[PDB]
Design a protein around this ligand. Structure first.
Ligand SMILES: Cc1cc2nc3c(=O)[nH]c(=O)nc-3n(C[C@H](O)[C@H](O)[C@H](O)COP(=O)(O)O)c2cc1C
Ligand SMILES: OC[C@H]1O[C@H](O)[C@H](O)[C@@H](O)[C@@H]1O
Length: 147
């Protein structure tokens, strides 16, 4: 199957997660294209994949990264019925609205018809060894749900 991952990372923590998850998936007989939101992908590309993984830190007052806002708006005009999807991100418990970018992106995927196949994966700040193992489990479980 043909998969896309679109991630946002300012200080590298969500990027580390993305690279682990994608590297695990690449060891299966599935293709994955990993795109940084800073490179401005158009949301319509999500219609052309079998599975979709989004990664995002949380910003401001429980908000999406600024660089995700246009893409998020454009998601209201795409049809993701049938696709399999999941979301991850780095988080900080010094904020009350912890990791809610993950929850916001899950909600939008649901509204557009995607089958969200995993709970949101939230890691505090920089992954430690156990968090990297959770990234492995997330990639492995995502693949199981494909066909
Ligand atoms: C201005 C600012 C606002 C933030 N807002 C939140 C927030 O509401 N909730 C949260 O969990 N983290 C929040 N964070 C923490 C970041 O999500 C956290 O540092 C994360 O590890 C960044 O991931 P990254 O390294 O991929 O950029 C905020 C950080 C900054 C600088
Ligand atoms: O693409 C726009 C339309 O897509 C789907 O029909 C949604 O269910 C509907 O709410 C939205 O207005």
């Amino acid at each position: 199957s043909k998969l896309v991952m679109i991630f946002a990372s300012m200080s590298g923590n969500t990027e580390e997660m993305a690279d682990h998850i994608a590297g695990v998936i690449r060891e299966t007989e599935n293709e994955i294209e990993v795109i940084d939101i800073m490179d401005s992908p158009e949301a319509s590309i999500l219609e052309q994949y079998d599975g979709i993984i989004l990664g995002a830190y949380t910003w401001g007052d429980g908000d999406l990264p600024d660089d995700f806002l246009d893409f998020y708006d454009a998601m209201d005009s795409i049809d993701l019925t049938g696709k399999k999807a999941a979301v991850f991100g780095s988080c900080d418990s010094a904020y009350p609205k912890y990791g809610v970018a993950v929850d916001i992106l899950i909600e939008k995927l649901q509204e557009r018809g995607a089958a969200v196949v995993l709970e949101g994966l939230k890691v505090e700040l920089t992954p430690e060894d156990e968090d990297v193992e959770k990234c492995l489990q997330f990639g492995a479980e995502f693949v199981k749900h494909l066909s």
